[PDB]
Amino acid sequence: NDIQWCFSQVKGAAEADIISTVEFNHSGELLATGDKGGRVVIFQQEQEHSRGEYNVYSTFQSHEPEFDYLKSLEIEEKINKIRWLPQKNAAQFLLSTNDKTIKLWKISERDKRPEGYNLKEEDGRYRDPTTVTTLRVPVFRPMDLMVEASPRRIFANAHTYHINSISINSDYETYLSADDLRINLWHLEITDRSFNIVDIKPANMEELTEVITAAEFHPNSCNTFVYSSSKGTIRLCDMRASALCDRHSKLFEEPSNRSFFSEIISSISDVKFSHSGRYMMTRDYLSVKIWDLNMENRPVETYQVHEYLRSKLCSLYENDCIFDKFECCWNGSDSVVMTGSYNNFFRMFDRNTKRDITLEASRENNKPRTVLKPRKVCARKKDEISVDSLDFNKKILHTAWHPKENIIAVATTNNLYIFQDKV
Amino acid sequence: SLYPIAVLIDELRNEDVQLRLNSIKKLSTIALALGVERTRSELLPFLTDTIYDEDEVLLALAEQLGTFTTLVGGPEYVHCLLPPLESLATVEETVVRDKAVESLRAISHEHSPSDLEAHFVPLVKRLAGGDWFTSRTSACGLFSVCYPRVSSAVKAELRQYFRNLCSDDTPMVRRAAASKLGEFAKVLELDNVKSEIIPMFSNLASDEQDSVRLLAVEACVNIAQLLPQEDLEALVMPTLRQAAEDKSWRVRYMVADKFTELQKAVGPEITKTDLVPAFQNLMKDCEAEVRAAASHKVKEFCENLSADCRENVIMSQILPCIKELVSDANQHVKSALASVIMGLSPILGKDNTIEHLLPLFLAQLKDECPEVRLNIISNLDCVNEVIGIRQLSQSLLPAIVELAEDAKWRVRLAIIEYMPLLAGQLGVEFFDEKLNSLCMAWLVDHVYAIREAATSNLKKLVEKFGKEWAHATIIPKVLAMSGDPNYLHRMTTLFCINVLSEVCGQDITTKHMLPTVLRMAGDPVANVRFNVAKSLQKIGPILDNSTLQSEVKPILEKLTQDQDVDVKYFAQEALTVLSLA
């Protein structure tokens, strides 16, 4: 039943080095991660199912720190989201976004260089031009393989607030970017203008009550996208109905837990469409809810990430941990969903069997093909971990699942863990 | 003398994009010097796949490769240019691929029929069957050029390859196939169009992707023009009807945007039966964009209707919908109608225009939005020849006055631009009684741009009403501003004289306008004084030689003694230009 996950690799070891996003590419051969320092590191799987290890493939500075001279504020270079485009040709394309700007990066391999000169040598030593009589055209020669990353297009100056989501449309042309209050529609080949489809900004900001937390395009349908709000509701929009998507087509929201923190914990931090596209998953602070797109009134499945923290919300509020934005991700078959937790714990929920397992990404098990022992949290029998002993600084916010294989990338604060199914 | 060529060849490796770009643009010079034989064996392999991939550099490279046929040895060796262009037809940039495809089409004509089947047709197959959809996207644009000049066996293969592209998994490929479907059908035989084009056209029109379906509207126009009228009902109309009723507003927008093109293709008989009901739905579409697009086509669509029922259909079917559009909430929809609704007057005639169209004109003239009001005023010629402007005069005037006095100066600017057009239409007599006061009020407007526009407005008005009207009406009033306490307004008189002198002629300028300019030379404000020097410079040539030596020269000489530096400089310049000193 349960998948026996095994330690495969650990990479990484300061604030600048903290990983802020993780994303496999469509084929799953490439794995990209971003950090608070604006750097993007791409790992390529060894292609010698495939269980080859991942090795550094490319590294570039996606974003640089900048100062907003209009608002007189600093602009963070932290990488919020990375999205791979479908492979157009031999090269690889991905979208990298910070709070303000989205950059389209091309990663291409070069294995040849020009050789031959008419007015000088390869060393740069010139010669008298009077003696140059016969012309010769340079000829390309093989060279050691190298990977080059360059910024092709920059989408900037469009968002007044901090960008939180980017999602590529299935039409291969457009993608959306959602800030706190606006969603803008972009054309991948046009940077000078954008289309603002959704704008929930109130006339008087004093009356502000909702902010957009996440947005995503439907994997198959080109006209369907959803966006969640801080109030815990998901609005599904149909671009076919009208040019402006202010009027949502569907609204997903549920009707003993009316505590002071109910408002805070209800905010949806991440929303993910299933690969099949029939189901939708949302992650709030305490639970993962899976929504059938044909049932607005309630989710079809609900899973508790960590119930033991429900009684400790007061402590979490004091140390600001209650505002953490955890993520979630489906597996290739949509049968298992993964989400992170505290103390370097990440949770696997099997929909078919309704079984749960808690796993720890720790260097203590730093031995290849070593089975991860399921963890248990108690509020203490043998091998159980006391709730009071949990370290809330160790947060697993960002995780990714291989699109086809049982390979998962789990990012701690400073280390990236890759786990593989026992084979 | 080969050193300059060596510099260009080396610059191809230069890191500087600008220097490398310049060398690419001069590839003809490099190829010409190297020779025909060396170009094929040395230059082209270097250009076959260049590591540098700047869009501007690749775009320039694609353009040059399309004119290299002579440099490579003529048509006998034209196929040597394919590998360089095949690589360019695979890059990620769209414009580079489009240019590369254009170059391939250009050189295809120079391929002999044997060469096409030996070198060019295989190239299309490689691109069509390539693993990267960028290559397959480019392949769509190459079928039409090679199909006509190949044997029947090769033609059958090409049609099969094109069919696979229309069914490609990637929407990018399918969009290209839909775009090129119309032209490919133009070269196919009529039998294959009915048998092979239509199934592909039908399948694409029902594609899941909205961006793909909307391209089927264009293919509908192209295919309709090819098929006989009797076959349109069976083959084309079922797909066209679905497009007008498509759930996606984008698809319906294309139908509205190209409605007139559809009207010509289908013919008058189909237009009455199907298009007219479809047009009514579009004008009542829920999306504002679709309604605005339909509004632009109201005039053209009604014009093309057959005379047997044109008047009846407009009055009974189209006209009621227009009334709703006039009161449309969306600003842009109302603006679209205003620019074209005036064109229905000739079609309906005098009696119908007064009874039905005229109330609509009055309603839009009173609309709050300045754009709607401006559009109606700008297109009064369509109604002048039908019912006469006198009937509209008493209703146009209140609208003009409000526009002329709008708070936003840019709104006031817009009406000024149409003033000479209205003045001619309304006649001299009406202008003097009603519109003359408005024109003068602009000359003293706070905003300089309005005063500048009004100054040029006088010239255009004089060009129509003639010198005599200007002397009696305009000149005595503009000269009155010379005494204005504000120096900005006093300079306006000089600006008016500068433009008026070009038309008012020598006699009027010397006797009435020139004395005022000379008097202002003693103005206490330096700004006025050196504008007099500039004014004399511009109108000096129009004056007689005797006048220049008698009056203009002594005044300019005095200005050169003025304390202010600017007055002396322009005074000196005026003398030099006029050759007086």
Next chain:
Amino acid sequence: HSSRLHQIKQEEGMDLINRETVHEREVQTAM
């Protein structure tokens, strides 16, 4: 204090003049 919605309200209150004035004092204080 840490709520994103609250931050926007604060950001929209200190928008026009206050933020520039605050930084001006900071720059002057830095000297």
Next chain:
Amino acid sequence: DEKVFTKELDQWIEQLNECKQLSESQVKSLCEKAKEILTKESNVQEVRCPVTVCGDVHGQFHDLMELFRIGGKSPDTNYLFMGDYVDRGYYSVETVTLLVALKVRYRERITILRGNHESRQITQVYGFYDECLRKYGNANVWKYFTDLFDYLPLTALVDGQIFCLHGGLSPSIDTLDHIRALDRLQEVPHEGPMCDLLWSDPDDRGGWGISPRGAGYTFGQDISETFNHANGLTLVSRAHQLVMEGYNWCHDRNVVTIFSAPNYCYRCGNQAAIMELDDTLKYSFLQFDPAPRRGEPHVTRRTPDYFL
């Protein structure tokens, strides 16, 4: 000769009007001749009516073009800018270059005062240094202009009745003669009369006060009334403070603030104003909105062509 340069200078103005930057060599030549003109000007420039008074522009070149369209083109209209020509704008280089170019060409028609942002420290913080560095690749252009700013007059006096300055009054200044005694050919000091003249602000609080900007002082109505009567001034034209309506009378019309940058920092959405002084010294105000930018705004709620 001067004629050849004058034609060359005219060509620069036409090029600048098109928002095209001058070359580094051209800028250096322009600045050198600008200093020769400015050095001869007193700390209290004597300006003659009629003239149009303008406030901060902050490198909003397209809005500067709007200002000319409203007030007229130089040299036909006499202008008096009260500083803050750079920073917080995409076109600070073009904005300052055009104004400096006009000053050299039409020294008698246009007067440019020194604003607080005309300082080496401020320009490096608020983007003018970056704009020059990005548009030229080196700091030479920034070095030239910052040196030129030192020669800009601190204040101007119009017909001996209207006193124009960027910041406002100072505790250390009681008569215009004190202003004339200052040495302005230096970097904006952090303290003293020169600093106050460029950083002070009017305030409702009576008397002097602590400036929230961290520099200068805040002066109440009583200070303004005493200063005007002492120097026989009718009005104190003032800049350096954002106002939504473009101009804002204060202190019983003893002080007027003029702001000439519409939609300040492309975000405020304020109105800009310019004060026109008639030949008889009577004052009038013209309010204008931001110039319609070509192909903008980038973000629109109307469907773009690529999606239509």
